[PDB]
Curated annotation (Swiss-Prot):
It comes from Homo sapiens. It comes from the Eukaryota. Residues 82-140 bind DNA. Interacts with PKM. Interacts with WWP2. Interacts with UBE2I and ZSCAN10. Interacts with PCGF1. Interacts with ESRRB; recruits ESRRB near the POU5F1-SOX2 element in the NANOG proximal promoter; the interaction is DNA independent. Interacts with ZNF322. Interacts with FBXW4. Interacts with SOX2 and SOX15; binds synergistically with either SOX2 or SOX15 to DNA. Interacts with DDX56. Several pseudogenes of POU5F1 have been described on chromosomes 1, 3, 8, 10 and 12. 2 of them, localized in chromosomes 8 and 10, are transcribed in cancer tissues but not in normal ones and may be involved in the regulation of POU5F1 gene activity in carcinogenesis. POU5F1/OCT4, SOX2, MYC/c-Myc and KLF4 are the four Yamanaka factors. When combined, these factors are sufficient to reprogram differentiated cells to an embryonic-like state designated iPS (induced pluripotent stem) cells. iPS cells exhibit the morphology and growth properties of ES cells and express ES cell marker genes. Expressed in developing brain. Highest levels found in specific cell layers of the cortex, the olfactory bulb, the hippocampus and the cerebellum. Low levels of expression in adult tissues. This is POU domain, class 5, transcription factor 1. Residues 1-73 form the POU-specific domain. It is found in: Cytoplasm; Nucleus. Transcription factor that binds to the octamer motif (5'-ATTTGCAT-3'). Forms a trimeric complex with SOX2 or SOX15 on DNA and controls the expression of a number of genes involved in embryonic development such as YES1, FGF4, UTF1 and ZFP206. Critical for early embryogenesis and for embryonic stem cell pluripotency. The gene is POU5F1. The modification Phosphoserine is found at S88. The chain holds residues 140 to 288 of 360 of the full protein.
DNA sequence: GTTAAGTGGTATTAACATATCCTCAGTGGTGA
DNA sequence: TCACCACTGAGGATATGTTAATACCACTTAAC
């Protein structure tokens, strides 16, 4: 209910403290990583300050930012002194994988290993990309 | 026979590439 | 021979589109 407006007020004050403290959003992610271990990317901080993330995510990142703003005010010099690695797919690999579809929608792990070795991609990367391919094709 | 773990299936989540934009530095047309 | 504001480009820093990656849940399967 009013949690929406309370989050919004917190986010506006958070923007004000970030601008006052002279920290970039990438620097905010770096500080969160070096003070908690869960380093976040600057896109998440952007979507936070603009209030773009979902409600559950909104509540999930509320406490970390609360702690950072309540702690970093003491000393900055010592603080100044674990990403969800997300490998990209280049266009020719994308085209080759699309070619691998339209014939066998759900390949076996035996074929998955061959596909991974053929295009030089990690097995887990190819497996998750295959799952998301199925997912977006089943959307429609 | 019951209960905990593995397997998928689908919803959320969060980072990448590139698209915009802020701000500051470098050059100069015009004026004095 | 001086000012300077206008004018614009560069790099860093934000907003987007988009999709790897994880995470939550129903179903089956293995252990005592």
């Amino acid at each position: 209910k009013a949690l929406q407006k309370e989050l919004e007020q917190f986010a506006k004050l958070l923007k004000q403290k970030r601008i006052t403290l002279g920290y970039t959003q990438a620097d905010v992610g770096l500080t969160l990583g070096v003070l908690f271990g869960k380093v976040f990317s600057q896109t998440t901080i952007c979507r936070f300050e603009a209030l773009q993330l979902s409600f559950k995510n909104m509540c999930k990142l509320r406490p970390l930012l609360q702690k950072w703003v309540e702690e970093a005010d003491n000393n900055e010099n010592l603080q100044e002194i674990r990403k969800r690695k997300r490998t990209s797919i280049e266009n020719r690999v994308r085209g080759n994988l699309e070619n691998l579809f339209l014939q066998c929608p759900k390949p076996t792990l035996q074929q998955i290993s061959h596909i991974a070795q053929q295009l030089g991609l990690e097995k887990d990367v190819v497996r998750v990309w295959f799952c998301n391919r199925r997912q977006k094709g089943k959307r429609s």
